[PDB]
Amino acid sequence: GRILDISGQPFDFDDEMQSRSDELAMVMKRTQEHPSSGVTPNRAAQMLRDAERGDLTAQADLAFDMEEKDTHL
Amino acid sequence: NYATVNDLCARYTRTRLDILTRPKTADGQPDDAVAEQALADASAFIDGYLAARFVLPLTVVPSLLKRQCCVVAWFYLNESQPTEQITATYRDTVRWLEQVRDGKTDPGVESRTAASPEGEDLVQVQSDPPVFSRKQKGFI
């Protein structure tokens, strides 16, 4: 029952989805920022540096806006 | 008013001021309200000539404006029959006020602390927020 992963660390496998854990109900439901409204290169650099440091939220929203906005892209 | 009657009666002799004022009053005796009213009218004249590029309730009063109010009050008080020199000096001070309004000459400062009266922005431009300007240290 103690299934080992690829890295050889035993653990217990659970059928419950991690999001549906009754503890992350208010952090899995986020209304998107849409940061690509009035972007200035300074602010784009700021969000890129924030993503580099570890906070990937702004970068992901910016990428989503770039995907849906720029038709050639 | 910019100048008080105690200054108009000093720059211009009080006896001549009484001679000019005593007819205008109702009773016929030397009065002081006529001179104050003339000074108020001259101050209104100067205020109109200065409101072009100044906040008119002047924070600091230029020190020459006392002279410029006394001369205009004196001319306004000699309207029946003025001397040629009074008219010439009134034309000179009107020319100076026109130059101040146009921008050729600043009124001056307060002689005590050398402070110039403030005013509204003569020139004012608005543009869209700056993007791609050199202040954007990103990219480059």
Torsion of CA B119, B124, B128, B134, to 10 degrees: -90
- In chain B, after which residues does the backbone break, taking C–N over 2.5 angstroms as a break? none
Mutate to test the interface with B, among A37, A39, A40 (most CBs of B within 10 A): A40
- What are the residues whose beta carbons fall under 8 Å from the beta carbon of B82, sequence distance 6 or more? B75
CB spacing of A40 vs B137 below 8 angstroms: no
Whole-angstrom distance, CA of residue B68 vs CA of residue B87: 14
CB spacing of B139 vs A40 below 8 angstroms: no
Whole-angstrom distance, CA of residue B6 vs CA of residue B68: 15
Residues from chain A contacting residue B139 (CB–CB below 8 Å): 41, 45
Question: B48: which 2 tokens?
Answer: 């109109």
Q: Is B134 on the interface with A (CB under 8 A)?
A: no
Q: How many CA atoms lie within 13 A of A65 on its CB side?
A: 15
Whole-angstrom distance, CA of residue A18 vs CA of residue A20: 5
Helix axes B33-50, B84-102, angle to 10 degrees: 40
Whole-angstrom distance, CA of residue B132 vs CA of residue A41: 7
Q: For residue B87, give the amino acid letter.
A: T
Tell me, in Å, the resolution of the deposited structure: 3.6
Radius of gyration, alpha carbons of chain B: 22
Residues from chain B contacting residue A46 (CB–CB below 8 Å): 138
- Which technique was the structure solved with, according to the deposited record? cryo-EM
Question: A38: which 2 tokens?
Answer: 């009035």
Shortest distance between the Cα of B128 and any Cα of chain A, in A, equals 12
Shortest distance between the Cα of A54 and any Cα of chain B, in A, equals 19
